[PDB]
């Protein structure tokens, strides 16, 4: 049922090539959330910093000969993830996340749509206890995520389980010569 | 100055449209529910905004986002007659980001299709369209065809209804069901 | 024969789709995950952004022992995480996210049918 | 594809700058936006439903709730008829999901506003 799905989690990973650009994106996201219309608090996500990656290309220093003179060209990347949980204002959250991006920063979005299945069967009022014949005769903190901590725990456990499954599948299916199976006509 | 004034008028018109034709329960919930009134209201609001969107002189990009239009107009004016030196030309972006009105408009952009289109495809909805005007057009065409017969009659009306059309008959060359979906926006 | 119905066409033809967004064809708890890429103007499409998957708990599915064993055997140990009793199904067979999602739904429905066959 | 993406793009396929084309673009970018086919057909359907209001009421009296549930298009027809006229053609009240009371009454005249500055 499309009408029943709920946006359980939306994790936006900003990928930037500049610390200034990443800081600008973070500040823009904060400002966008600070002006969100509806106890009630802005949909503050849970920040999650990601490490820094690098790459190198090595070249000589000379146009001819002199192999012992070498130069290194180093590149950098930065990643920072913010997670919204139990997102009701989907439009507002997405608009803020996409408009926060500054400079050359890109973003990768991670959506989770959850369906609760068949609703639990309602139990009516339990029968009341009566004396017998014998008796007759005788959110609050600013900047913190407003969603439920148990909800966050369940979402995180599901995320970790799916990450383990993805890693296992990728590692099993990885190949250097894709398409080759042992003993098949090579 | 005239372009900036037009951008402000457009933002005011968008606010007035939002207050005049609000989407109850949120845009995402309205889209998922797919109620005729919600689709009609969203399409009306979108078409009014499209009609009211101005055509500026100093920009050749007709931005549909009032935030983008206003920010670009402000940036052009700042570059033209507000930059003393390279430091100012670099701080223009910080100046734009420090405006409270732009901060407010930052969280009022339209919902991109991919937020829900993959979910609808996974669910298996083929009579759907993320575009509100397209959904309204489909619903209204179906209603017109049903009315054409509304004048053994309920059976004929149901036969003419879109939902009761075999999937095999959509194209002769693919006599198999569940082969055609909804066009992405 | 020289002309045959391909497996994906068979899956589409035998798949049952809901009549309206108010009808659910799964009936069990689950979470659907997909990735989308946004950023400044770009000429090259971001790779590895077309796959989607569905994760659910066998306990939540609430099947008999034979059906649970059949589900685990069909999905293999790679798609089953024992620490939290979770199971995940992936689909990255096409370069389009919508096509991958439709294929994922069809295969999930077929998997549930096969499990019920247990 | 990967091997055919090494060198620079052709430098002889870059667009030229022509005053005639610049003027043509300047003239064309101010072109008007017509009303949408969806809204025109909505007006036509509203007129048809108002004309055949009696047939709609008869059909909804003959039909049951389960048929409406199984045919969503009939839900759209019911919503259109309800916004056109306040009468409740169905014998039994409908569930909120199939139809939620909008509180709206009708289109080119309803969708209008004026102001100056």
């Amino acid at each position: 049922a499309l009408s029943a799905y709920s946006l359980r989690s939306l994790i936006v990973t900003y990928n930037s090539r500049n610390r200034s650009s990443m800081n600008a994106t973070i500040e823009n996201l904060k400002n966008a959330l600070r002006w969100t219309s509806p106890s009630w608090s802005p949909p503050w996500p849970v920040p999650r910093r990601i490490g820094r990656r690098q790459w190198r290309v090595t070249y000589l220093k000379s146009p001819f000969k002199y192999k012992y003179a070498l130069r290194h060209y180093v590149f950098e990347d930065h990643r920072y993830a913010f997670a919204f949980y139990d997102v009701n204002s989907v439009q507002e959250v997405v608009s803020a996340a996409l408009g926060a991006m500054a400079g050359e920063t890109c973003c990768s979005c991670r959506f989770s749509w959850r369906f609760a299945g068949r609703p639990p069967v309602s139990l009516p009022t339990p029968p009341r206890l009566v004396p017998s014949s014998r008796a007759a005769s005788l959110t609050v903190l600013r900047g913190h995520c407003p969603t439920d901590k148990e909800f966050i725990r369940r979402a995180l456990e599901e995320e970790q389980a799916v990450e383990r499954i993805r890693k296992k599948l990728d590692k099993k299916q990885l190949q250097w010569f894709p398409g080759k199976t042992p003993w098949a006509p090579k | 100055a005239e372009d900036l004034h037009k951008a402000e008028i457009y933002t005011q018109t968008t606010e007035k449209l939002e207050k005049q034709w609000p989407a109850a329960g949120g845009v995402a919930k309205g889209i998922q529910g797919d109620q005729f009134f919600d689709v009609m209201a969203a399409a009306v609001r979108e078409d009014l905004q499209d009609q009211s969107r101005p055509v500026l002189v100093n920009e050749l990009t007709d931005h549909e986002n009032p935030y983008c239009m206003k920010r670009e107009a402000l940036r052009r004016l700042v570059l033209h007659a507000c930059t003393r030196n390279c430091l100012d030309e670099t701080l223009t972006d910080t100046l734009l980001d420090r405006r409270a009105d732009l901060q407010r408009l930052r969280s009022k952009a339209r919902l991109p299709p991919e937020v829900l289109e993959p979910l609808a495809a996974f669910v298996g909805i083929t009579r759907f369209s993320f575009d509100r005007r397209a959904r309204l057009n489909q619903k209204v065409t179906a209603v017109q065809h049903a009315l054409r017969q509304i004048s053994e009659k309920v059976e004929a009306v149901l036969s003419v209804l879109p939902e009761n059309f075999p999937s095999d008959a959509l194209h002769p060359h693919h006599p198999f069901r569940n082969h055609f979906g909804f066009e992405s926006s | 024969g020289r002309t045959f119905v391909t497996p994906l066409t068979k899956l589409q033809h035998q798949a049952a789709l809901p009549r309206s967004p108010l009808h659910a064809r799964f009936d069990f708890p689950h979470t659907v995950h997909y990735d989308v890429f946004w950023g400044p103007p770009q000429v090259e499409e971001e790779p590895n952004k077309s796959g989607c998957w569905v994760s659910f708990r066998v306990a939540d599915l609430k099947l008999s022992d034979s059906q649970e064993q059949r589900l685990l055997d069909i999905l293999g140990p790679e798609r089953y995480d024992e620490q939290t009793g979770v199971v995940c199904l992936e689909a990255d067979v096409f370069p389009q996210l919508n096509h991958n999602a439709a294929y994922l739904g069809d295969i999930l429905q077929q998997l549930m049918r096969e499990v019920k066959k247990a | 594809r990967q091997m055919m993406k090494w060198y620079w793009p052709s430098k002889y396929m870059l667009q030229d700058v022509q005053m005639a084309q610049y003027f043509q673009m300047q003239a064309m970018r101010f072109a008007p936006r017509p009303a949408h086919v969806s809204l025109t057909t909505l007006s036509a359907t509203m007129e048809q439903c108002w004309k055949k209001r009696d047939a709609v009421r008869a059909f909804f009296q003959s039909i049951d709730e389960k048929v409406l549930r199984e045919n969503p298009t009939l839900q759209d027809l019911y919503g259109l008829y309800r916004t056109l006229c306040p009468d409740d053609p169905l014998r039994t009240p409908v569930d909120p999901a199939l139809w939620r009371n909008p509180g709206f009454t009708w289109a080119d005249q309803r969708i209008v506003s004026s102001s100056t500055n």
Binding site: - | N164 | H13 | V67, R69, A97
Partner: peptide
């Protein structure tokens, strides 16, 4: 709270066209 997990067979039995739509033609 309007999820309809099971389609009503009575409506499809009553109406033939919906019956055909729900029917799966043979491979």
């Amino acid at each position: 709270s309007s999820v309809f997990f099971e389609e009503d067979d009575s409506v499809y039995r009553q109406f033939a066209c919906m019956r055909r739509v729900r029917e799966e033609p043979r491979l």
